[PDB]
Design an enzyme around this catalytic site. Structure first.
Site, PDB file in Angstrom:
ATOM      1  N   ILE A   1       7.140   6.899  -1.121  1.00 46.79           N
ATOM      2  CA  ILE A   1       8.099   7.385  -1.943  1.00 46.79           C
ATOM      3  C   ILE A   1       8.840   8.717  -1.412  1.00 46.79           C
ATOM      4  O   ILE A   1       9.802   9.054  -2.014  1.00 46.79           O
ATOM      5  CB  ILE A   1       7.552   7.642  -3.369  1.00 46.79           C
TER       6      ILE A   1
ATOM      7  N   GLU B   1      -8.588  10.199   1.633  1.00 49.16           N
ATOM      8  CA  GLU B   1      -7.747  10.463   2.631  1.00 49.16           C
ATOM      9  C   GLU B   1      -7.194   8.925   2.950  1.00 49.16           C
ATOM     10  O   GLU B   1      -6.635   8.674   3.883  1.00 49.16           O
ATOM     11  CB  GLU B   1      -8.497  10.891   4.033  1.00 49.16           C
TER      12      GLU B   1
ATOM     13  N   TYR C   1       0.876  -1.254   0.145  1.00 50.85           N
ATOM     14  CA  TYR C   1       0.016  -0.041  -0.107  1.00 50.85           C
ATOM     15  C   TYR C   1       0.770   1.117   0.023  1.00 50.85           C
ATOM     16  O   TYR C   1       1.773   1.336   0.800  1.00 50.85           O
ATOM     17  CB  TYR C   1      -0.876  -0.064   1.203  1.00 50.85           C
TER      18      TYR C   1
ATOM     19  N   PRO D   1       1.899   8.199   2.571  1.00 50.50           N
ATOM     20  CA  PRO D   1       3.023   8.782   3.473  1.00 50.50           C
ATOM     21  C   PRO D   1       3.337   8.121   4.880  1.00 50.50           C
ATOM     22  O   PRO D   1       4.427   8.392   5.319  1.00 50.50           O
ATOM     23  CB  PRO D   1       2.412  10.193   3.570  1.00 50.50           C
TER      24      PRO D   1
ATOM     25  N   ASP E   1      25.302   2.094 -11.539  1.00 53.32           N
ATOM     26  CA  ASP E   1      24.953   3.078 -10.945  1.00 53.32           C
ATOM     27  C   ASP E   1      26.186   3.556 -10.198  1.00 53.32           C
ATOM     28  O   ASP E   1      26.909   2.675  -9.788  1.00 53.32           O
ATOM     29  CB  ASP E   1      23.566   3.156 -10.251  1.00 53.32           C
TER      30      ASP E   1
ATOM     31  N   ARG F   1      14.016  -1.266 -13.508  1.00 51.40           N
ATOM     32  CA  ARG F   1      15.341  -1.172 -14.016  1.00 51.40           C
ATOM     33  C   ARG F   1      16.186  -2.376 -13.383  1.00 51.40           C
ATOM     34  O   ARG F   1      17.371  -2.592 -14.046  1.00 51.40           O
ATOM     35  CB  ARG F   1      15.997   0.347 -13.294  1.00 51.40           C
TER      36      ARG F   1
ATOM     37  N   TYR G   1       5.815  13.597   1.384  1.00 48.75           N
ATOM     38  CA  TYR G   1       5.224  14.633   0.833  1.00 48.75           C
ATOM     39  C   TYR G   1       3.745  13.844   0.551  1.00 48.75           C
ATOM     40  O   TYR G   1       3.775  12.732   0.358  1.00 48.75           O
ATOM     41  CB  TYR G   1       5.770  15.429  -0.443  1.00 48.75           C
TER      42      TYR G   1
HETATM   43  N1  LIG Z   1       4.604   9.877  -0.135  1.00 51.33           N
HETATM   44  C1  LIG Z   1       3.716   8.842  -0.770  1.00 51.33           C
HETATM   45  O1  LIG Z   1       4.319   7.774  -1.248  1.00 51.33           O
HETATM   46  C2  LIG Z   1       2.229   9.091  -1.082  1.00 51.33           C
HETATM   47  C3  LIG Z   1       1.182   8.100  -1.083  1.00 51.33           C
HETATM   48  C4  LIG Z   1       0.161   8.269  -1.303  1.00 51.33           C
HETATM   49  C5  LIG Z   1      -0.287   9.665  -1.638  1.00 51.33           C
HETATM   50  N2  LIG Z   1      -1.630  10.267  -1.692  1.00 51.33           N
HETATM   51  C6  LIG Z   1      -2.555   9.196  -1.604  1.00 51.33           C
HETATM   52  C7  LIG Z   1      -2.865   8.919  -0.136  1.00 51.33           C
HETATM   53  C8  LIG Z   1      -2.886   7.430   0.263  1.00 51.33           C
HETATM   54  C9  LIG Z   1      -2.962   7.012   1.724  1.00 51.33           C
HETATM   55  C10 LIG Z   1      -3.150   8.332   2.641  1.00 51.33           C
HETATM   56  C11 LIG Z   1      -3.463   9.498   2.112  1.00 51.33           C
HETATM   57  O2  LIG Z   1      -3.749  10.785   2.896  1.00 51.33           O
HETATM   58  C12 LIG Z   1      -3.373   9.868   0.550  1.00 51.33           C
HETATM   59  N3  LIG Z   1       0.516  10.852  -1.429  1.00 51.33           N
HETATM   60  C13 LIG Z   1       1.961  10.246  -1.072  1.00 51.33           C
END
Ligand SMILES: NC(=O)c1ccc(NCc2cccc(O)c2)nc1
Ligand SMILES: NC(=O)c1ccc(NCc2cccc(O)c2)nc1
Lengths: 242, 242
Positions: free
Chosen positions: A136, A119, A89, A92, A165, A157, A139
């Protein structure tokens, strides 16, 4: 060969054309090195308006992914994947992705990537359906699709045949130069014109070390530098102190 | 309003359909809150085969972006942008993107994003044409397009009107729950059903603090916790130690 199959759960499957139809990843898909298969929770709805979001218990301004269509899409992807698929999954709140984490994820022959919108998803689905939660970077985006594509591209890759690299040894890349020999008064370092392969190798390595030290010195403290690297870094630092 | 214009230099402009045609970002583009304009260096070539790559001085297995078509595309984007556009190059050597960096970049009314492919671009172009070099994380991708899209999506969220964060106060998000009340035996926390807004607010904040502490404790050391936050974190930690 070391074919990779990636199942994707997304309300916007067409976004993934950005990786399946273009460039190096598009070629990997066309040559069957990489398979990307998408399931859209909207297809697993049963109401007239194909509702895919739902209100959070406890109130608040946001929405969540509706559980039933998302759960059903995930179950369908798992059934397609068969045995041994790791379900990831993107959020953030997840483990921060870096190149070592990419190399770990690339060991999987099958992955299922769940892309949250709104959300995100119900915490209990994370508990019951998700194997690993990854981020990732620190942010927030409008959806998990770009993070899933980012992950797919990075792991692709490592599939043999995908690439035709300095990061591999943990350092930032050295500067690179191509034609012309002079560009707005700036010349190519003469060593790169010398044809001296060993001098060129050492120059590049020294530049990588100097650049890593100046821009990202914390990356250096995570490394066990080789003898040669310790030497070139000392030289680069001495030249910096003039 | 606080309209944002983003010029993009890319050999694969069609990848950007993933953000301009779908979701929240697609709506921002349709409503003219966000403008994304692409220039393809291939259109600035003059040879029969429209060559956009070139060999690096000093040898090596990789290629670089050819200077002349890329330079010309950049100059054209700058002319379109007029005054005050910040030119950004996406690379693993750049400043690491995080939410604070996103909020900084979002202050710009105009951005030009240069997407490198192959082993990137000539170092002298970075010196003469690029204002800032940014990275979306410590990993390597097949091109700068996904990083540019990632950046565009993240900054778009700060454009007024685009959206209909706990990260704002620097913490990971709390768990969220939606229907049904019970899901594979797992129940929704009763507090979220209580209708008690203040208890719910404090529960969520405490969960965010506990989650940040357990998953990303280094994020906590970067914060000046409020009185209330110090209290709820202490409570969460005591409950964790039973
Ligand atoms: N930093 C990341 O990997 C990343 C991943 C998803 C995302 N947005 C979808 C989402 C997913 C879960 C909660 C949420 O609040 C928003 N934004 C950034
Ligand atoms: N971490 C990033 O923001 C990121 C950016 C670009 C990229 N690939 C294109 C590229 C660009 C420059 C040098 C180079 O070697 C490859 N991959 C990852």
């Amino acid at each position: 060969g070391s074919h990779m199959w990636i199942g994707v759960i997304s309300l916007f499957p067409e976004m993934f054309k950005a990786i399946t139809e273009f460039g190096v990843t598009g070629r990997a898909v066309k040559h069957n090195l990489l398979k990307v298969e998408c399931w859209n929770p909207r297809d697993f709805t049963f109401d007239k308006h194909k509702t895919v979001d739902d209100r959070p218990y406890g109130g608040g301004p946001g929405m969540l992914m509706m559980v039933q269509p998302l759960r059903d899409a995930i179950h369908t992807a798992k059934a397609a994947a068969g045995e041994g698929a790791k379900v990831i999954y993107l959020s953030p709140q997840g483990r921060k992705l870096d190149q070592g984490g990419v190399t770990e994820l690339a060991q999987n022959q099958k992955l299922i990537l769940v892309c949250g919108r709104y959300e995100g998803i119900d915490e209990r689905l994370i508990q019951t359906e998700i194997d690993e939660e990854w981020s990732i970077g620190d942010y927030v985006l409008t959806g998990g699709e770009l993070p899933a594509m980012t992950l797919i591209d990075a792991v692709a890759r490592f599939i043999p045949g995908v690439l035709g690299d300095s990061f591999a040894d943990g350092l930032l890349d050295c500067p690179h130069y191509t034609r012309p020999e002079v560009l707005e008064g700036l010349t190519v370092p003469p060593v790169l014109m010398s044809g001296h392969h060993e001098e060129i190798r050492k120059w590049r390595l020294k530049q990588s070390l100097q650049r890593t030290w100046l821009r990202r010195p914390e990356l250096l403290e995570g490394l066990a530098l080789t003898d040669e690297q310790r030497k070139l870094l000392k030289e680069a630092q001495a030249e910096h102190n003039s």
